[PDB]
Amino acid sequence: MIINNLKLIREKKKISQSELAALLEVSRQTINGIEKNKYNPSLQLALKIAYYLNTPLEDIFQWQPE
Amino acid sequence: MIINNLKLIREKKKISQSELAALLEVSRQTINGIEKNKYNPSLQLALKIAYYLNTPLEDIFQWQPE
């Protein structure tokens, strides 16, 4: 479903969990938790992740049938 | 936060709450529930909502500093 493949993008740019999380102003554990199973980020926060991370939602959040 | 002011966009094109929800493959209850206050949509689903709705997430989910 969500897949939360943000980390792949993060490692893609060699991104650290701390930096974008710093950019997001949210806990690093949460951000690196989301890729695992942590409650999905709020839509604007997702926009922020995309906007600050500089990547479209689709790439960071994989598209699935569901 | 999210605001979920999708409704306004949905009314804006005279979109049926039912129709996109069907496109999304989710209940109107949920889709029209989210705009009211129901749990925020799955991020991937959100992509789909904008995708079927044909409008950016930000329009439906406006930006709030937090």
mmCIF file of all heavy atoms in Angstrom, chain B residues 33-52:
data_model
loop_
_atom_site.group_PDB
_atom_site.id
_atom_site.type_symbol
_atom_site.label_atom_id
_atom_site.label_comp_id
_atom_site.label_asym_id
_atom_site.label_seq_id
_atom_site.Cartn_x
_atom_site.Cartn_y
_atom_site.Cartn_z
ATOM 1 N N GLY B 33 -16.258 11.604 4.762
ATOM 2 C CA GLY B 33 -16.009 11.602 6.191
ATOM 3 C C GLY B 33 -14.726 12.360 6.492
ATOM 4 O O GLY B 33 -14.640 13.110 7.478
ATOM 5 N N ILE B 34 -13.724 12.154 5.640
ATOM 6 C CA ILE B 34 -12.419 12.774 5.817
ATOM 7 C C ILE B 34 -12.544 14.280 5.754
ATOM 8 O O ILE B 34 -11.995 14.990 6.599
ATOM 9 C CB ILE B 34 -11.447 12.279 4.728
ATOM 10 C CG1 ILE B 34 -11.131 10.796 4.944
ATOM 11 C CG2 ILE B 34 -10.143 13.076 4.775
ATOM 12 C CD1 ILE B 34 -10.374 10.248 3.733
ATOM 13 N N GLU B 35 -13.303 14.767 4.797
ATOM 14 C CA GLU B 35 -13.517 16.191 4.692
ATOM 15 C C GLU B 35 -14.208 16.704 5.943
ATOM 16 O O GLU B 35 -13.902 17.793 6.424
ATOM 17 C CB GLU B 35 -14.326 16.534 3.440
ATOM 18 C CG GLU B 35 -15.673 15.823 3.466
ATOM 19 C CD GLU B 35 -16.459 16.152 2.214
ATOM 20 O OE1 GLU B 35 -15.874 16.164 1.155
ATOM 21 O OE2 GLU B 35 -17.641 16.390 2.336
ATOM 22 N N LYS B 36 -15.141 15.915 6.472
ATOM 23 C CA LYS B 36 -15.823 16.291 7.706
ATOM 24 C C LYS B 36 -14.877 16.244 8.903
ATOM 25 O O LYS B 36 -14.765 17.227 9.638
ATOM 26 C CB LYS B 36 -17.037 15.389 7.958
ATOM 27 C CG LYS B 36 -18.321 16.121 7.528
ATOM 28 C CD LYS B 36 -19.060 15.305 6.465
ATOM 29 C CE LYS B 36 -19.044 16.079 5.142
ATOM 30 N NZ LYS B 36 -18.840 15.139 4.024
ATOM 31 N N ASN B 37 -14.150 15.120 9.053
ATOM 32 C CA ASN B 37 -13.167 14.957 10.153
ATOM 33 C C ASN B 37 -12.602 13.532 10.238
ATOM 34 O O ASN B 37 -11.802 13.232 11.137
ATOM 35 C CB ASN B 37 -13.785 15.329 11.515
ATOM 36 C CG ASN B 37 -14.508 14.129 12.119
ATOM 37 O OD1 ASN B 37 -13.972 13.461 13.002
ATOM 38 N ND2 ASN B 37 -15.692 13.809 11.691
ATOM 39 N N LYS B 38 -13.060 12.640 9.368
ATOM 40 C CA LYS B 38 -12.630 11.237 9.433
ATOM 41 C C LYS B 38 -11.114 11.153 9.267
ATOM 42 O O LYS B 38 -10.501 12.048 8.672
ATOM 43 C CB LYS B 38 -13.336 10.394 8.343
ATOM 44 C CG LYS B 38 -13.471 8.921 8.789
ATOM 45 C CD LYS B 38 -14.716 8.773 9.679
ATOM 46 C CE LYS B 38 -14.909 7.308 10.113
ATOM 47 N NZ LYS B 38 -15.106 6.418 8.929
ATOM 48 N N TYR B 39 -10.518 10.106 9.836
ATOM 49 C CA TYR B 39 -9.062 9.887 9.770
ATOM 50 C C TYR B 39 -8.531 10.291 8.406
ATOM 51 O O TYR B 39 -9.176 10.052 7.391
ATOM 52 C CB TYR B 39 -8.744 8.401 10.020
ATOM 53 C CG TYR B 39 -9.891 7.563 9.494
ATOM 54 C CD1 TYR B 39 -10.071 7.409 8.115
ATOM 55 C CD2 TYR B 39 -10.784 6.962 10.384
ATOM 56 C CE1 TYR B 39 -11.142 6.663 7.631
ATOM 57 C CE2 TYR B 39 -11.848 6.208 9.896
ATOM 58 C CZ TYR B 39 -12.029 6.060 8.523
ATOM 59 O OH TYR B 39 -13.105 5.342 8.046
ATOM 60 N N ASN B 40 -7.370 10.918 8.383
ATOM 61 C CA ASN B 40 -6.806 11.371 7.122
ATOM 62 C C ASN B 40 -6.591 10.198 6.180
ATOM 63 O O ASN B 40 -6.434 9.056 6.623
ATOM 64 C CB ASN B 40 -5.501 12.143 7.338
ATOM 65 C CG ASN B 40 -5.817 13.575 7.737
ATOM 66 O OD1 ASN B 40 -6.603 14.245 7.068
ATOM 67 N ND2 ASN B 40 -5.269 14.088 8.791
ATOM 68 N N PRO B 41 -6.628 10.443 4.899
ATOM 69 C CA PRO B 41 -6.493 9.377 3.870
ATOM 70 C C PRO B 41 -5.085 8.809 3.826
ATOM 71 O O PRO B 41 -4.112 9.508 4.143
ATOM 72 C CB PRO B 41 -6.831 10.100 2.560
ATOM 73 C CG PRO B 41 -6.453 11.520 2.813
ATOM 74 C CD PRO B 41 -6.793 11.778 4.282
ATOM 75 N N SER B 42 -4.965 7.576 3.372
ATOM 76 C CA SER B 42 -3.658 6.987 3.194
ATOM 77 C C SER B 42 -2.897 7.845 2.186
ATOM 78 O O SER B 42 -3.506 8.431 1.280
ATOM 79 C CB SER B 42 -3.800 5.556 2.670
ATOM 80 O OG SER B 42 -4.857 4.897 3.372
ATOM 81 N N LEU B 43 -1.597 7.992 2.373
ATOM 82 C CA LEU B 43 -0.836 8.920 1.543
ATOM 83 C C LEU B 43 -0.926 8.540 0.097
ATOM 84 O O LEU B 43 -1.168 9.383 -0.762
ATOM 85 C CB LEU B 43 0.630 8.919 1.956
ATOM 86 C CG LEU B 43 0.781 9.581 3.317
ATOM 87 C CD1 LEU B 43 2.211 9.403 3.797
ATOM 88 C CD2 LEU B 43 0.479 11.069 3.179
ATOM 89 N N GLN B 44 -0.798 7.270 -0.171
ATOM 90 C CA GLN B 44 -0.898 6.800 -1.522
ATOM 91 C C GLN B 44 -2.303 7.051 -2.054
ATOM 92 O O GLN B 44 -2.487 7.509 -3.180
ATOM 93 C CB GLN B 44 -0.542 5.321 -1.606
ATOM 94 C CG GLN B 44 -0.411 4.909 -3.069
ATOM 95 C CD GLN B 44 -1.473 3.886 -3.413
ATOM 96 O OE1 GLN B 44 -1.251 3.037 -4.249
ATOM 97 N NE2 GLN B 44 -2.626 3.938 -2.829
ATOM 98 N N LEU B 45 -3.291 6.814 -1.209
ATOM 99 C CA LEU B 45 -4.671 7.080 -1.569
ATOM 100 C C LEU B 45 -4.827 8.571 -1.848
ATOM 101 O O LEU B 45 -5.405 8.969 -2.857
ATOM 102 C CB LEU B 45 -5.608 6.633 -0.425
ATOM 103 C CG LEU B 45 -7.045 6.380 -0.934
ATOM 104 C CD1 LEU B 45 -7.688 7.681 -1.402
ATOM 105 C CD2 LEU B 45 -7.036 5.363 -2.085
ATOM 106 N N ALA B 46 -4.205 9.390 -1.007
ATOM 107 C CA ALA B 46 -4.229 10.839 -1.199
ATOM 108 C C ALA B 46 -3.708 11.199 -2.580
ATOM 109 O O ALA B 46 -4.274 12.061 -3.260
ATOM 110 C CB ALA B 46 -3.385 11.545 -0.137
ATOM 111 N N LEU B 47 -2.666 10.507 -3.017
ATOM 112 C CA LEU B 47 -2.115 10.761 -4.340
ATOM 113 C C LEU B 47 -3.189 10.458 -5.356
ATOM 114 O O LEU B 47 -3.411 11.215 -6.309
ATOM 115 C CB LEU B 47 -0.948 9.811 -4.617
ATOM 116 C CG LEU B 47 0.229 10.099 -3.693
ATOM 117 C CD1 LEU B 47 1.285 9.005 -3.888
ATOM 118 C CD2 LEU B 47 0.837 11.460 -4.042
ATOM 119 N N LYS B 48 -3.876 9.361 -5.115
ATOM 120 C CA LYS B 48 -4.958 8.924 -5.959
ATOM 121 C C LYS B 48 -6.101 9.927 -5.939
ATOM 122 O O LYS B 48 -6.738 10.174 -6.971
ATOM 123 C CB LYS B 48 -5.432 7.528 -5.531
ATOM 124 C CG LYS B 48 -4.320 6.516 -5.874
ATOM 125 C CD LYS B 48 -4.701 5.094 -5.440
ATOM 126 C CE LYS B 48 -3.595 4.123 -5.893
ATOM 127 N NZ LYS B 48 -3.922 2.731 -5.496
ATOM 128 N N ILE B 49 -6.376 10.489 -4.763
ATOM 129 C CA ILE B 49 -7.480 11.427 -4.639
ATOM 130 C C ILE B 49 -7.222 12.617 -5.543
ATOM 131 O O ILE B 49 -8.052 12.966 -6.380
ATOM 132 C CB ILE B 49 -7.588 11.935 -3.184
ATOM 133 C CG1 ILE B 49 -7.926 10.779 -2.250
ATOM 134 C CG2 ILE B 49 -8.696 12.991 -3.076
ATOM 135 C CD1 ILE B 49 -7.899 11.273 -0.799
ATOM 136 N N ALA B 50 -6.020 13.160 -5.447
ATOM 137 C CA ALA B 50 -5.624 14.278 -6.289
ATOM 138 C C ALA B 50 -5.581 13.853 -7.739
ATOM 139 O O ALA B 50 -5.968 14.610 -8.634
ATOM 140 C CB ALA B 50 -4.255 14.800 -5.860
ATOM 141 N N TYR B 51 -5.094 12.642 -7.964
ATOM 142 C CA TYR B 51 -4.956 12.100 -9.307
ATOM 143 C C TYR B 51 -6.309 11.994 -10.007
ATOM 144 O O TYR B 51 -6.492 12.536 -11.106
ATOM 145 C CB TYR B 51 -4.287 10.723 -9.216
ATOM 146 C CG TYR B 51 -4.227 10.061 -10.567
ATOM 147 C CD1 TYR B 51 -3.304 10.492 -11.525
ATOM 148 C CD2 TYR B 51 -5.095 9.004 -10.858
ATOM 149 C CE1 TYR B 51 -3.251 9.866 -12.771
ATOM 150 C CE2 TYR B 51 -5.041 8.378 -12.099
ATOM 151 C CZ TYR B 51 -4.119 8.809 -13.057
ATOM 152 O OH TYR B 51 -4.065 8.186 -14.284
ATOM 153 N N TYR B 52 -7.278 11.367 -9.348
ATOM 154 C CA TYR B 52 -8.627 11.284 -9.913
ATOM 155 C C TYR B 52 -9.322 12.621 -9.891
ATOM 156 O O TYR B 52 -10.025 12.986 -10.837
ATOM 157 C CB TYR B 52 -9.483 10.230 -9.222
ATOM 158 C CG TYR B 52 -9.193 8.874 -9.816
ATOM 159 C CD1 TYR B 52 -8.847 7.809 -8.991
ATOM 160 C CD2 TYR B 52 -9.292 8.680 -11.204
ATOM 161 C CE1 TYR B 52 -8.598 6.556 -9.548
ATOM 162 C CE2 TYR B 52 -9.042 7.425 -11.752
ATOM 163 C CZ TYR B 52 -8.696 6.364 -10.924
ATOM 164 O OH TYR B 52 -8.448 5.125 -11.465
#
